[PDB]
């Protein structure tokens, strides 16, 4: 019963920590936006990219649009 | 879970119909692409050498993010009772995935210092490492509880 | 590109110079404190 | 030394930086542009040869299409990767003086020694 | 180039002129010490 509670209550705190880790990953993505801005533009942070989880067709269309800055 | 899937384009290299059209009114609406973003620049940026150092450290930052994602997707889900935290409950920077991915408001004073991010990135990485360490401590506690599980009751039911 | 590097170099030099000037002011305050202490000592001796 | 008038003009047109003097073979054009994008970032300028003559290897006289080139490094942090890229190029690489006359004199002295 | 001129004597001039601010701090320190000494002597 204690193991089940830990998987339900202590692991509820683990899920809260997972949400905090998701927040940290969002902050990391925010930092990476400025990192890419510095890498492919001037030093000051300014980005016009986007973050999502699109389908293959949408990613292909985005790459076709952005082929002016292809890798 | 899902690994990183963010696109790479500066302000001067917007792929939308207009430079400011990345957030909305882009051709992505026609293709139903869920892409969204909102600017949140830092107070200042480092030099060229600082930029190169940050780019080098971005690999370690991505590795740490991947480790945190793997831990969150494995330890919580495997317990069969910890995956109850939905996207709203696990909202990134206080906003769900619909809004968290549409803005960079996480660059506020919580993980970074709202300042030149050359060391603020390392500080936020250390904070994320501490969070992952807490998650690993919880996973170890769950493992010890499972060790407490499958106890002497696992033997025969008597007369055996 | 190079103009942004120019601003960073000037900003770093400006901040360093201001910090050095503030440190020199603090050192001067400590120096006048020591001078006042030794002046008090010599006045007490006199 | 040829880059002391070509690469310098290219950098002036494109504009603290490092010296990426060395070499890059005729087949290193892709690696100079497609690769090392993080370090170069597109703000650097370079002058390269097309291996007009077979340049002998630094430890071999058999020679190949080992063109020599001089570029600008985007700081020491980027110069760390620039040195690795130049090593991957593997052509007849040797640093020279910044001055065009001094670089030409060094080239003449090395040719006389050879 | 422009970057070379930026990293040129333009910044080293201020780096060396920080000695002027240091000298001003020393001068004001000496003036304050002399004023305090005059006051206590009086």
UniProtKB/Swiss-Prot annotation, chain C:
Function: Subunit of the peripheral V1 complex of vacuolar ATPase essential for assembly or catalytic function. V-ATPase is responsible for acidifying a variety of intracellular compartments in eukaryotic cells.
Oligomeric form and interacting partners: V-ATPase is a heteromultimeric enzyme composed of a peripheral catalytic V1 complex (components A to H) attached to an integral membrane V0 proton pore complex (components: a, c, c', c'' and d).
Family in the record: Belongs to the V-ATPase E subunit family.
Parent-record interval covered: 13 to 58 of 230
Official protein name in the record: V-type proton ATPase subunit E
């Amino acid at each position: 019963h204690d193991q089940e509670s830990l998987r339900s209550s202590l692991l509820q705190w683990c899920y809260t920590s997972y949400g905090e880790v998701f927040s940290s990953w969002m902050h990391f993505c925010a930092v990476r936006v400025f990192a890419e801005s510095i890498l492919r533009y001037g030093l000051p942070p300014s980005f016009l990219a986007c973050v999502l989880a699109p389908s293959v067709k949408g990613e292909k269309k985005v790459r076709s649009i952005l082929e002016e800055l292809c890798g | 879970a899902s690994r990183y899937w963010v696109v790479s384009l500066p302000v001067q290299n917007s792929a939308a119909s207009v430079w400011n059209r990345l957030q909305e009114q882009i051709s992505k609406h026609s293709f139903d692409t869920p892409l969204y973003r909102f600017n949140i620049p830092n107070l200042r940026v480092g030099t060229l050498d600082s930029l190169l150092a940050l780019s080098d450290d971005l690999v370690k930052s991505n590795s740490f993010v991947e480790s945190v994602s793997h831990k969150i997707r494995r330890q919580i889900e495997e317990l069969e009772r910890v995956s109850g935290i939905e996207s709203s409950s696990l909202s990134v920077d206080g906003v769900p995935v619909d809004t968290y991915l549409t803005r960079f408001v996480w660059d506020e004073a919580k993980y970074p210092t709202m300042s030149p991010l050359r060391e603020i990135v390392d500080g936020i990485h250390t904070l994320v490492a501490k969070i992952e360490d807490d998650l690993k401590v919880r996973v170890a506690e769950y493992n010890n509880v499972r060790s407490q599980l499958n106890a002497i009751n696992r033997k025969q039911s008597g007369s055996l | 590109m190079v103009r942004f590097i120019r601003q960073e170099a000037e900003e770093k030099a400006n901040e360093i110079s201001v910090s050095a000037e503030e440190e020199f002011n603090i050192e001067k305050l400590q120096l006048v404190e020591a001078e006042k202490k030794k002046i008090r000592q010599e006045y007490e001796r006199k | 030394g040829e880059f002391f008038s070509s690469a310098l003009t290219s950098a002036a047109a494109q504009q603290k930086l490092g010296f990426i003097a060395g070499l890059v073979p005729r087949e290193k054009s892709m690696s100079f542009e497609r690769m090392l994008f993080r370090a170069t970032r597109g703000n650097v300028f370079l002058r390269q040869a097309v291996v007009d003559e077979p340049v002998v290897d630094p430890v071999s006289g058999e020679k190949m299409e080992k063109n020599v080139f001089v570029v600008f490094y985007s700081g020491e942090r980027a110069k760390n990767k620039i040195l690795k890229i130049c090593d991957a190029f593997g052509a007849n690489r040797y640093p020279f003086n910044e001055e065009f006359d001094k670089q030409a004199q060094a080239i003449s002295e090395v040719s006389g020694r050879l | 180039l422009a970057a070379e001129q930026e990293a040129q004597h333009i910044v080293a001039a201020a780096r060396n002129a920080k000695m002027a601010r240091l000298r001003q701090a020393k001068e004001e320190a000496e003036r304050e010490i002399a004023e305090h000494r005059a006051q206590v002597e009086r």
